[PDB]
């Protein structure tokens, strides 16, 4: 059967169709689009009846009552007729409120919280909101189970209504025990250190909610929920229980292979934010090719003290050889130590202050214009006519940072914003004299009340410059392109492109291609597509997070699908367009690269997997596209 007609009789203030438009039960379904069905059922009729009651109550009709409702069906049992008899009554305006009862000394707050504009129309939804907000106010002071009722008294002579509300706060409840359930791997202290409600203290509903939201922002759990059931037999004692379930945070992968493009490869990667349930953030990246020997260990203890002070330490080593046997080609050794200290200054703000040392060893660099600008900034004058050169620097950096984190949730936020500023400056005595600032923002604005439709605005900013006449080193250059930046482009390719001097190329073999090899007869310097990045960067993106159109409820919480639009550019502020006129101007930031496409993020058992497909609808010469991209982590 199906709904044949929804009819309202006795209504005069509003159109019958307008009254029906709020009902879940649909009188008619349009032919040009699908928005529902007319399948009648008893349960949603009560909800629509309550909705109709609320719609009449929030327009001053305090005397509203439903006389009766008649569900009827055709003799052939295919059609359903629903009719409701309505007595609207007169329209009334709220003439004032009166508060009485045991207010427990909170009268100055209750009377102000229940204050109204005189002569305003009566609103049942406002009455219910007031009833709940009084409960919230009393619960913030430990009165977790108050007794509050409000009855409207109606004057049929004056056409006004008075709300006499009775309030009894009851006993102030104390919490004796806080329990955690489902933390199979996470240490109890990890959950307990996010608390703001203390055991053996009077209850705070705001404190419990803040503890719940901090556990949500921690990111190690999901579907965090609370209950505050009373201890049996006691006038005022409660047990506050936090129920969580644990996900496999992070990922670990390794790979060994032979005879590939990189030769014999051994690449591994570790990333856990909740290492063994201890709360430590541990990352162990590394690879061993014929061309690179890399290892990076980063361990952070977010609660080095009980107050939340963090103590991070990053140790890394990078060694790149552009050729295996001859050892005369490009070589880049990079190793250093980075220890950082972070502490919170507010409920949502934290500051970082650390020291960083890095050693870079360069030899046989292939001539490039911006690189040579950097070398002349450092005071060295190697020869530009050949690839015989070397440069070596030890740098000490004061690393500082500030993070604002009011996100709704740790992994897939639906409300709030995160801002993460990171900065560095060289301590005097270092070889390089430079500074760097990086700002990352991510703001989530939910479109629907269920937070299924969220719009996300991500902006990523970067700037670096030299401090004492010397320039910012090119190993600190920004890069764009890939999953972590503007999508749809080849990874780390967006930005300035290298311009190569005509030079004697090392280990030259005639059957390969070289950018300005003098063996090829290169009279003048080459324009190329080889990306070197730039000292400045500005990347922005707007994403529309949408529900997955085919997923089930049990998998919906781990799959995120979104349409996106990326904006970004990387440029070299110190580039000189006057000296190099015919070559492209890399000092211009106006070459913003754009792309739009679909992204799918998945909390897989193999770790967070992100699948993306983007079309670079704005693209410039000397750049290449990669539409389909994927990431192994986050």
């Amino acid at each position: 059967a199906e709904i044949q007609q929804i009819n309202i009789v006795g209504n005069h203030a509003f159109t019958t169709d307008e009254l029906i438009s709020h009902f879940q039960l649909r009188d008619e379904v349009p032919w040009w689009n699908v928005v529902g069905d007319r399948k009648y059922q008893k349960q949603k009729l009560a909800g629509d009846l309550e909705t109709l009651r609320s719609y009449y109550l929030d327009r001053g009709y305090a005397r509203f009552n439903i006389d009766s409702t008649q569900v009827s069906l055709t003799p052939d049992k295919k059609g359903i007729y629903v009719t409701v008899n309505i007595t609207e009554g007169d329209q009334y305006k709220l003439s004032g409120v009166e508060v009485s009862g045991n207010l427990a000394g909170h009268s100055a707050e209750i009377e102000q919280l229940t204050k109204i504009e005189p002569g305003e129309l009566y609103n049942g939804t406002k009455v219910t909101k007031m009833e709940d907000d009084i409960k919230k106010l009393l619960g913030r002071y430990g009165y977790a189970y108050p007794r509050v009722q409000s009855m409207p008294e109606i004057n049929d002579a004056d056409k006004t209504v008075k709300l006499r509300v009775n309030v009894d706060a009851g006993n102030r409840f104390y919490v004796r025990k806080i329990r955690f359930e489902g933390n199979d791997t996470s240490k109890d202290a990890v959950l307990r250190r996010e608390m703001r409600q203390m055991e053996g203290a009077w209850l705070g509903s705001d404190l419990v909610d803040q503890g719940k939201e901090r556990l949500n922002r921690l990111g190690f759990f999901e579907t965090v929920d609370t209950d505050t059931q009373r201890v049996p037999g006691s006038p005022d004692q409660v047990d506050v229980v936090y129920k969580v379930k644990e996900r496999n945070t992070g990922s670990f992968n390794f790979g060994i292979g032979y005879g590939t493009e990189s030769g014999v490869s051994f690449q591994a990667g570790v990333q856990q934010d909740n290492w063994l349930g201890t709360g430590y953030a541990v990352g162990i990246n590394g690879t061993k090719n014929d061309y690179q020997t890399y290892a990076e260990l980063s361990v952070t203890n977010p609660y080095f003290t009980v107050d939340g002070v963090s103590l991070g330490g990053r140790l890394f080593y990078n060694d790149f050889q552009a050729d295996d046997a001859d050892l005369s080609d490009y070589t880049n050794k990079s190793y250093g130590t980075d220890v950082t200290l972070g502490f919170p200054i507010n409920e949502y703000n934290s500051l970082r202050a650390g020291l960083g040392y890095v050693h870079n060893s360069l030899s046989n660099m292939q001539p490039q214009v911006a690189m040579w600008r950097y070398l002349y900034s450092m005071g060295e004058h190697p020869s530009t006519s050949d690839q015989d050169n070397s440069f070596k620097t030890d740098d000490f950096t004061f690393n500082y940072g500030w993070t604002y984190n009011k996100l709704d949730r740790g992994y897939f936020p639906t409300d709030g914003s995160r801002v993460n500023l990171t900065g560095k400056v060289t301590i005097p005595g270092s070889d390089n004299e430079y500074y760097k600032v990086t700002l990352d923002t991510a703001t989530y604005v939910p479109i629907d009340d269920d937070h299924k439709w969220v719009v996300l605005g991500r902006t990523r900013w970067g700037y670096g410059d030299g401090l004492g006449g010397k320039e910012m080193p090119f190993y600190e250059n920004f890069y764009a392109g890939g999953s972590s930046t503007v999508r749809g482009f080849q990874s780390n390719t967006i930005g300035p492109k290298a311009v190569y001097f005509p030079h004697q190329a090392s280990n030259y073999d005639p059957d390969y291609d070289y950018e300005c090899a003098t063996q090829d007869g290169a009279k003048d310097l080459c324009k190329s597509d080889d990306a070197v990045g730039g000292n400045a960067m500005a990347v922005a993106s707007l994403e529309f997070i949408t529900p997955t159109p085919f997923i089930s409820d049990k998998y919906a919480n781990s799959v995120r699908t979104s349409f996106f639009w990326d904006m970004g550019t990387v440029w070299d502020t110190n580039w000189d367009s006057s000296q190099y006129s015919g070559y492209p101007d890399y000092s211009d930031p106006s070459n913003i690269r754009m792309s739009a496409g679909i992204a799918l993020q998945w909390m897989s058992p193999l770790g967070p997997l992100v699948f993306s497909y983007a079309q670079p609808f704005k693209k410039y010469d000397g750049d290449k596209a990669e539409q389909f991209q994927f990431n192994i982590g986050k």
Binding site: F252, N253, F254, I256, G257, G259, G607
Partner: peptide, 15 residues
């Protein structure tokens, strides 16, 4: 999850 390609072995760890 593990994958062996032509003389190339990969692995991912769950749990």
């Amino acid at each position: 999850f593990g994958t062996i390609h032509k003389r190339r072995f990969r692995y991912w760890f769950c749990g």
